[PDB]
Design a protein around this ligand. Structure first.
Ligand SMILES: [Zn+2]
Length: 60
């Protein structure tokens, strides 16, 4: 395809040595999933990692 740009959020600031950090960006993970329990800053990052972890399992 081609896709476009991202939203207009700035919730990806530095993160102290202990807090969660985005697994796709690299700043902070204010949000955390349940199944994967990963860390993300926005909602797009969440699915961006989930749909990426599924293909990694292969099959099905
Ligand atoms: Zn992010």
């Amino acid at each position: 395809g081609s896709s476009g740009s991202s939203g207009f959020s700035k919730t990806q600031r530095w993160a102290e040595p202990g807090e969660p950090i985005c697994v796709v960006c690299g700043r902070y993970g204010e949000y955390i999933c349940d199944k994967t329990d990963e860390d993300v800053c926005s909602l797009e990052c969440k699915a961006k990692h989930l749909l990426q972890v599924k293909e990694k399992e292969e099959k099905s």
